[PDB]
Write a protein that binds this DNA or RNA. Sequence first.
RNA 1: GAUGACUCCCAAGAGCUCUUAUCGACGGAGUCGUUUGGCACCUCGAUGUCGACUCAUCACAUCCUGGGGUUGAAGAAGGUCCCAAGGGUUCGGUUGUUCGCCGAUUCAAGUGGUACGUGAGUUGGGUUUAGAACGUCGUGAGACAGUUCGGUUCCUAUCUACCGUUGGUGUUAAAGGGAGAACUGCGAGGAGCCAACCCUAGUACGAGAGGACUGGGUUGGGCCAACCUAUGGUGUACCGGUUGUUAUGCCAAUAGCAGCGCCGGGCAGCUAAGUUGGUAUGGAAGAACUGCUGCUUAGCGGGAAAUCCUUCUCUAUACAAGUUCUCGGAACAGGUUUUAGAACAGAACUUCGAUAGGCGGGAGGUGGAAGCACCGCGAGGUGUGAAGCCAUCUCGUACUAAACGA
Lengths: 141, 127, 41, 155, 218
Amino acid sequence: FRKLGRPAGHRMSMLRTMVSQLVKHERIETTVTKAKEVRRLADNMIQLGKEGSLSAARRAAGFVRGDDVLHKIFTELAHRYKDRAGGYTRLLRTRIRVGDAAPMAYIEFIDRENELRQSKPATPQPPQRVPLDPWERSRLT
Amino acid sequence: FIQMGTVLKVVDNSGAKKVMCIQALKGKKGARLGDTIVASVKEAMPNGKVKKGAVVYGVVVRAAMQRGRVDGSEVRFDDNAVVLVDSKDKNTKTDRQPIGTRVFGPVPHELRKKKHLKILALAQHVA
Amino acid sequence: KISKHKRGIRNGPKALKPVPVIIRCRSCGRVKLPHFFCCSG
Amino acid sequence: LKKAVAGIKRINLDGLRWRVFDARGQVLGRLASQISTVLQAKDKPTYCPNRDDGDICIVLNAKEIGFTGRKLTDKFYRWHTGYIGHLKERSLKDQMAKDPTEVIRKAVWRMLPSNNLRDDRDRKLRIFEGGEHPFGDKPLEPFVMPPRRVREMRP
Amino acid sequence: EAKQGEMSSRSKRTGIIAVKCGMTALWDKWGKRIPISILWVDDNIVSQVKTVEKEGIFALQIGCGQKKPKHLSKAVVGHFRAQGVPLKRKLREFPVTEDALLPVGTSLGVRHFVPGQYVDVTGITRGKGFQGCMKRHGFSGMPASHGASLSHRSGGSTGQRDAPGKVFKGRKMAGRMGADQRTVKNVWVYKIDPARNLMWVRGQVPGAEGNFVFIKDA
RNA sequence: GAUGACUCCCAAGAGCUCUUAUCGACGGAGUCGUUUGGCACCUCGAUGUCGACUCAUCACAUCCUGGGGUUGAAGAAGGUCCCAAGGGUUCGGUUGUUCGCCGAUUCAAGUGGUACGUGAGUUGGGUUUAGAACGUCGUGAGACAGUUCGGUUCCUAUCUACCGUUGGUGUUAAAGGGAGAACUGCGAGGAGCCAACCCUAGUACGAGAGGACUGGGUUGGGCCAACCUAUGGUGUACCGGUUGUUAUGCCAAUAGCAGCGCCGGGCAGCUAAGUUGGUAUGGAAGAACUGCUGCUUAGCGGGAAAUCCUUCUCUAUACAAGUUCUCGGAACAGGUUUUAGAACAGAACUUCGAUAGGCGGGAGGUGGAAGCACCGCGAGGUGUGAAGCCAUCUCGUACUAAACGA
């Protein structure tokens, strides 16, 4: 939803570098309302590590770049979330300081050696059930 | 919208071939499909009932403006065409009376609802 | 042209409000508004 | 509504005097000027013009009221609502079938002296268009108009 | 429209408060298409009967929706509890006559509305933000090929020493347009359901894509 | 206020009869300040000048609609006059045009004021700078209240005014008195249009020709308010086709860039060319106008799209400051969003949780993925295959970020 105020080519060609660096390194310190944005490309590039086929690999070849973070994804992030269904980043709000009142934010993955908020355990999802519309909860007191 | 300056085809078999709008008797933007327009003939056979440069009325029969029936259905022809009616130079009794003998080219049967049953009866086949 | 009266009146209602609730890393030193990542434990 | 009609006598000074003007249904202006005095405290000796010692004067039964001539349907009340064009006008018959209190209240308001104690005097004035009033238990002094009414008569 | 619902000869029955679900398209038996709105009534109930005797005016306090103690702010938790009334998403009062007066705790629903007759809705509409003229009021605008720094703006008040710099209450670009605007004398209710308590209306009911509408005139 | 427009006075004569339907000669009476003007009082250490666009507003001395009198009013079309400003008052052709002529229409295409409204809103064609030229005047320099061509439009809004959005504060009270809802609505705004057509009815009227009165009904235009479910337009982080080039050695499949690179599509969102919805009833007062009583003073009743109430909106800073319920570790505040949004505000969610993301399932858009197999030398085609993907929408799941120990 964010524009970040950048021509839509330059905006992508930045977000690519950001997700790619977020995978090369393990943590980064960036302006929050932009971390709130890599919050999506990181996960949609983890899903391709989980799938790993030739199709869904040659597709990730377009979205990640810089180095062989491609292989880093495919080799370690899959094998470290072969189970975790959704939610592969933490996006904490450090507001460290800048000279521009711009907030700042730690963003980094989950099941590493030294994470920031010691996570919950990767539980497989339960399978779907039919939705209903009783609207029967009075909630009186 | 068929409005001032439009240049639409005569599609009865009166004298005039091409007729150029100047009005829309019951619109404020252009007149949608099925409504009397006023217009000035632009070319005629030398012998028909109408001669170039003469204000003459008309009824719309084909308009690139899409229009939907009350059925939710929608239709849109290709080009603009109208059929003539004798001007008000004849009294109110003859309101909605054509000039030629046979139109040719598909016709929408919204002319009935618009009360142009006279031109309607002559129609080849009503869309 | 317009004097202390109007100048004070305009700069006033732009006054600094003391910040509400403010928490410190009980032992980890820093002070912070809520919802920050001061520390870890 | 005892509350909504008992007014704000919880705001004035109370400790001076309560007095009652009951127009017997005679005449606007000759009720009025008498009020504009009593309700300005210029009628007792200890007057001093930088203050409000207006006594409580309470008018009664504005339904039974008389305005001579035929102004009733001729003299309207005019007021301007700011919005361009408008001038909302209302005859006295309308005004009296609506609320025959507003009439005299506005009139004495205009008669009172044109200074910012005027509102702060009307804060010492109450009205019932009946004879029924809840301000009875307080010390009530019914008032008599001057003995100066020769009342010239005509054929 | 008379002799229906539940009342005597002449009165105003209470209003019922619903939610704009969306629009769709029905048909009639004579084979014609009408747009449709679905207003969802969330089990509305009576929560206060207002009184000229005690308070001063005749009003039924209908609550709508459902809420939770973690969502109410205690000053209203207390209200609902003292009334002993199931929790609702939004309250709303109606003034109705001496008759058409309900007991505390009687739920309402769409069968209160006889089909085939009309309603009046009131839906806090869909503002658009700090719009400007030429959309706020359908003003025109100077041409786009001759005039500079005006292509989309407005004119100027009457103005000169007379009407002395006194722009009367005019029409300027202004803040948003979210407000409550009735659609007086609506067109008949197609159908309402015994269960599911919906109701379809010929169309164009104000209010958001949900969360807001009231109904009366019946 | 002379001329000016209008009204009024008188009334020769026209109106076949007739002064006053309609006019009205001579001669007067006044009202207004709109054409022409008079005076030179404010401004020349500045008061920007015609016309057009936008935006209106008032008066009524009324163009239609609205009522009545009267007519040389049979009916119908009119005439004239009284009351009336609620709502309206069109497009285009030549001219810079205001004006005006015209063509096509309508219920009508009103007359003035508003610094001949409106340039710190726009235009800048005329016209009053410099150039240039034609005719005329001047014996030349030059002028022309004649003509034609071209001839920089400045200002970041302090205040008053005005559209909106908010924070403080006052409001007796009981808790230090702090609040959350829910109203009432002193009072302010808004909306008031018209045509066609049918019927009643070929009825009243008239020799027919012609053609009613009124009330009901339909069908349209304008104006306004609202809604995108459909249709259109768009849809810049979607799907596919496609050119030039650079890279990933190359094939394969992708990327950058060409101000989406260009095409064909495109949901949700927004909009109108689309769709809705309104253009009312009831009540009071009451216009000329009309009647009847009266008892010569007066009495009341009809009586207009007019005024005021009923609908819609706004409102308790409505200072006579209103009323009801409830909270009292209550209200806030912060964080995730938002059907709401410039900040603020409102509304949703804040872990006994669906607030947003993420992941699964569909829906919804594009339109036959790659690899593999076949057919052909190839361009390329067919099968595996409604395949393949995914901007949005719903639906499951707390996997992420919204508790809180100030």
